[PDB]
Design a protein around this ligand. Sequence first.
Ligand SMILES: O=c1ccn([C@@H]2O[C@H](COP(=O)(O)OP(=O)(O)O)[C@@H](O)[C@H]2O)c(=O)[nH]1
Ligand SMILES: O=c1ccn([C@@H]2O[C@H](COP(=O)(O)OP(=O)(O)O)[C@@H](O)[C@H]2O)c(=O)[nH]1
Length: 124
Amino acid sequence: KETAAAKFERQHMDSSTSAASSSNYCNQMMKSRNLTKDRCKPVNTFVHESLADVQAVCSQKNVACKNGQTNCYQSYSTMSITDCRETGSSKYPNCAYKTTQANKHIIVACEGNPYVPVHFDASV
Ligand SMILES: O=c1ccn([C@@H]2O[C@H](COP(=O)(O)OP(=O)(O)O)[C@@H](O)[C@H]2O)c(=O)[nH]1
Ligand SMILES: O=c1ccn([C@@H]2O[C@H](COP(=O)(O)OP(=O)(O)O)[C@@H](O)[C@H]2O)c(=O)[nH]1
């Protein structure tokens, strides 16, 4: 079965490109990462940095999570990310997304032993 850590990697990691993310990037990525299978996931961020660099965020700046939990961490450096947001006209199963590339600090929640990212909270 898929671990929480593995799900984070599937949903949020894309180390292969520096940013490139064509205007088609989210339409393609959201489907293939299985985020459009049961419904159109409304909002999802992919991070274009090495796995070790994203894992390292769990030992960086501790900040409150949006839900009030205390186990969120903000990257000291900006990171290459792509935000995917479902369009107004998108209708399941034809999930359609706007693709927006940015360099921002990421905030992730970390859990477990080993202590690793399990949830993408925000970018700032
Ligand atoms: O900048 C963002 C904001 C949210 N999400 C995703 O959207 C999901 C829904 O957000 P959350 O679980 O924190 O609850 P909500 O924001 O919907 O109240 C998150 O788990 C993330 O997978 C994301 O990928 N990037
Ligand atoms: O602010 C948060 C939000 C979520 N989680 C944990 O992150 C994991 C993945 O979250 P979820 O299953 O809700 O999926 P997501 O919303 O991130 O897509 C779960 O073990 C939650 O306990 C957390 O530790 N802090």
